[PDB]
Design an enzyme around this catalytic site. Structure first.
Site, PDB file in Angstrom:
ATOM      1  N   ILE A  87     -19.760  54.135  11.007  1.00 60.72           N
ATOM      2  CA  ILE A  87     -19.888  52.721  11.351  1.00 60.72           C
ATOM      3  C   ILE A  87     -18.591  51.975  11.182  1.00 60.72           C
ATOM      4  CG2 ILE A  87     -21.027  50.503  10.761  1.00 60.72           C
ATOM      5  CD1 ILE A  87     -23.273  52.345   9.471  1.00 60.72           C
ATOM      6  N   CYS A  88     -18.270  51.175  12.173  1.00 63.20           N
ATOM      7  CA  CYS A  88     -17.119  50.321  12.110  1.00 63.20           C
ATOM      8  C   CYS A  88     -17.562  48.904  11.809  1.00 63.20           C
ATOM      9  CB  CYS A  88     -16.402  50.348  13.431  1.00 63.20           C
ATOM     10  SG  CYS A  88     -15.099  49.126  13.529  1.00 63.20           S
TER      11      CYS A  88
END
Ligand SMILES: [Ca+2]
EC number: 2.3.2.23
Length: 202
Positions: free
Chosen positions: A93-94
């Site tokens: 996840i960014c």
């Protein structure tokens, strides 16, 4: 064996907070203890309404560092998802709160709620998955349909493109692994030729 007291007490408190929250009573978020010493948890979030993810439920692997609450949990999507800020391959996840904008006042609840908000508001110019971000930018409608297809196949959402479904069943019936097929088609603009060519490259 056991984590530092400040970490233990924070996780216990935050775990109870999620259990009692209006959001969990509305089936929007939840958290499950995986490990008795609180170092690993499993999350779940509901796809937000009026998005391609609506109707889906997304499971999350949550690992709590020894330094909690001064560093963020490490979070990854277990449920496969098609979104510019999440890896379609690893679930990585960014999101700034998991990276450089963590603050110690944040909680399991607010992380789960921020991830749902990320589903409803992608940032394609700072992406985790270049292929998905490009599609999102260059062909919005194809992106929406692809994301909805993935929500249906992986996250239990009700609806998806019959066109897309037919292409998938065609290639699966031809002997290819279904996940490989979904990935190949999704990454090659749903073009059976280039997708098939990619599948034969393996
Ligand atoms: Ca210890």
């Amino acid at each position: 064996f056991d984590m530092a007291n400040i970490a233990v007490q924070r996780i216990k408190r935050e775990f109870k907070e999620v259990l009692k929250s209006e959001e969990t009573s509305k089936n929007q978020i939840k958290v499950d203890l995986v490990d008795e010493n609180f170092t690993e948890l499993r999350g779940e979030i509901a796809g937000p309404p009026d998005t391609p993810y609506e109707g889906g439920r997304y499971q999350l692997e949550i690992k709590i560092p020894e330094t909690y609450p001064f560093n963020p949990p490490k979070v990854r999507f277990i449920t496969k998802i098609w979104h510019p800020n999440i890896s379609s391959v690893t679930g990585a996840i960014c999101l700034d709160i998991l990276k450089d904008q963590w603050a110690a006042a944040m909680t399991l609840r607010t992380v789960l709620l921020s991830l749902q908000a990320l589903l409803a508001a992608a940032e394609p110019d700072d992406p985790q998955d270049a292929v998905v971000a490009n599609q999102y930018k260059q062909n919005p409608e194809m992106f929406k349909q692809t994301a909805r297809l993935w929500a249906h196949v992986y996250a239990g959402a009700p609806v998806s493109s019959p066109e897309y479904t037919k292409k998938i069943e065609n290639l699966c019936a031809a002997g290819f692994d279904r996940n490989a097929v979904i990935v190949a088609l999704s990454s090659k603009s749903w073009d059976v030729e280039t997708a098939t060519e990619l599948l034969l490259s393996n």
